[PDB]
C-alpha cells in the first residue's frame, strides 16, 4: 500500500460543463426547487463524494519494524522447511528444463525465489536458465522482501547471501539513534 | 420485440400410433402493427373468441368498426393457410380457440394545448393474435341447475369437520 497512487477522479458540481443558470424559477410552477442543472440530484450532474484527483497512500513503517519483518520471514521459511542454502548457483547446462527437473526431483515446490549477491556476479548459466522460467525468480540480495518470499513457495539463498543478510539485519539491533541520515559518513558505517 | 406466435406453426409432432385420437390441427396466425387501439381491438377479439370460422366471418362482415375488416382479413388468411399448409381438409371445419389483441410499438407527438402548455399524443398501434383448431366449436358450458346447486351445498355440508379438537 505505500507505493500505491490512485488516479481515479470525478467531476464535482462545479467542474461539469454548464449549469450556471437557475432553471424554472423558484416559486412559480409546481416543480421541485432547483438552482442548477449539474447538481448531484440530476442525470449528468456532478458527483457528491466521488474520488478526487490522484490520491497517494504513502506511509513508512519504522526501519526496525521492517527489518524485524525480514528476519521473521526468514525464520518462518527455515522453520517450515522452505529455506535452502547453496554454496553457489551454478548449472552445468544452463537450460530451464534442467532447473525445473532439479526442483521437481528435490521436491522444493512450484515457485522458487533464488537470491544472489550484487546482481553482477550472477552467473550466465543461472541467468539464462531463469530468464525463461515463470515461477523461478532470480533476484539479488538487495531485493529480498516479505512479499516475494511469501509469494514464492521456496527460498533459495547462497552462503554469501546468508552472511550479507545476517550482517544487514543484525546491524538494526545494537545501533544508536540516527542523529542524521545513514547515507552520511558515520565513521564505522560503510 | 418478441415474435413467438409466428413460430408456433413450426412445431413438428412425432407420428401418432395407429390407435390414437385424431389430434386436430392447430394453426396460429397474427397481424403486427395495426393502426388501431388495443382495447378497441380487444372488444372485437372477445366477440370472435368462441365462434366457428364461418360464424366469426359473418359477424365481422356486418360490424362497422375499423378493426372488424382487419380481423376478417387475418381470419381469411389463417383459413387459407390452414387448408393449404397444415392439412385441414374441410375449410369450414375450423373454430377459434384464442383471439386476443396486444399492444404494439407506438409513437409520440405534441398536442399544442391552448396556452404555452401542451400534451403528448401517442400514435397507437396493436397486434392481433388468432388461433384456429380443426373441428366443430366446443359446446358452451350450460348454466348450472338448481340440482347442481343443491348437490354442491350438500357436499359442502358433508365435508365439514370438528375443528380445533382431536
Amino acid at each position: 500500500n505505500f507505493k500505491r497512487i490512485s488516479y481515479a477522479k470525478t467531476k464535482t458540481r462545479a467542474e461539469v460543463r454548464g449549469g450556471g443558470r437557475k432553471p424554472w424559477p423558484q416559486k412559480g410552477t409546481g416543480r421541485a426547487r432547483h438552482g442548477s442543472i449539474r447538481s448531484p440530484l440530476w442525470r449528468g450532474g456532478g458527483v457528491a463524494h466521488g474520488p478526487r484527483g490522484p490520491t497517494s497512500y504513502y506511509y513508512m513503517l519504522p526501519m526496525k519494524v521492517r527489518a524485524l519483518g525480514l528476519k521473521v520471514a526468514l525464520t518462518v521459511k527455515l522453520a517450515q522447511d522452505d529455506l535452502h542454502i547453496m554454496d553457489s548457483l551454478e548449472l552445468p547446462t544452463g537450460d530451464p528444463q534442467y532447473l525445473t527437473e532439479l526442483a521437481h526431483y528435490r521436491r522444493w515446490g512450484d515457485s522458487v525465489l533464488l537470491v544472489d549477491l550484487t546482481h553482477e556476479e550472477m552467473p550466465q548459466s543461472i541467468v539464462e536458465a531463469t530468464s525463461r522460467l515463470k515461477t523461478f525468480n532470480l533476484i539479488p540480495a538487495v531485493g529480498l522482501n516479505v512479499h516475494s518470499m511469501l509469494k514464492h513457495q521456496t527460498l533459495v539463498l547462497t552462503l554469501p547471501t546468508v552472511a550479507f543478510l545476517e550482517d544487514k539485519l543484525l546491524w538494526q539491533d545494537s545501533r544508536y539513534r540516527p542523529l542524521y541520515p545513514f547515507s552520511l559518513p558515520y565513521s564505522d558505517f560503510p | 420485440i418478441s415474435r413467438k406466435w409466428e413460430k408456433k406453426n413450426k412445431i413438428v409432432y412425432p407420428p401418432q400410433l395407429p390407435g390414437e385420437p385424431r389430434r386436430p390441427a392447430e394453426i396460429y396466425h397474427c397481424r403486427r402493427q395495426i393502426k388501431y387501439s388495443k382495447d378497441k381491438m380487444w372488444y372485437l377479439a372477445k366477440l370472435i373468441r368462441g365462434m366457428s370460422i364461418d360464424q366469426a366471418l359473418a359477424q365481422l362482415e356486418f360490424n362497422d368498426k375499423k378493426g372488424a375488416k382487419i380481423i376478417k382479413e387475418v381470419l381469411l388468411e389463417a383459413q387459407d393457410m390452414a387448408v393449404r399448409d397444415h392439412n385441414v381438409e374441410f375449410r369450414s371445419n375450423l373454430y377459434i380457440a384464442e383471439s386476443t389483441s396486444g399492444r404494439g410499438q407506438c409513437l409520440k407527438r405534441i398536442r399544442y394545448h391552448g396556452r404555452g402548455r401542451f400534451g403528448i399524443m401517442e400514435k397507437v398501434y396493436c397486434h392481433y393474435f388468432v388461433k384456429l383448431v380443426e373441428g366443430p366449436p366446443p359446446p358452451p358450458e350450460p348454466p348450472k341447475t338448481a340440482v347442481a346447486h343443491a348437490k354442491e351445498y350438500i357436499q359442502q355440508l358433508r365435508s365439514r369437520t370438528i375443528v380445533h379438537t382431536l
Binding site: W24, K27, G28, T29 | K108, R115, G116, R117, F118
Partner: peptide
Amino acid sequence: KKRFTPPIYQPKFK
C-alpha cells in the same frame, strides 16, 4: 404584485 410564470417548452426532439 403581478406574479406570472411563463410556460416552459420541452425540447422538440422528444
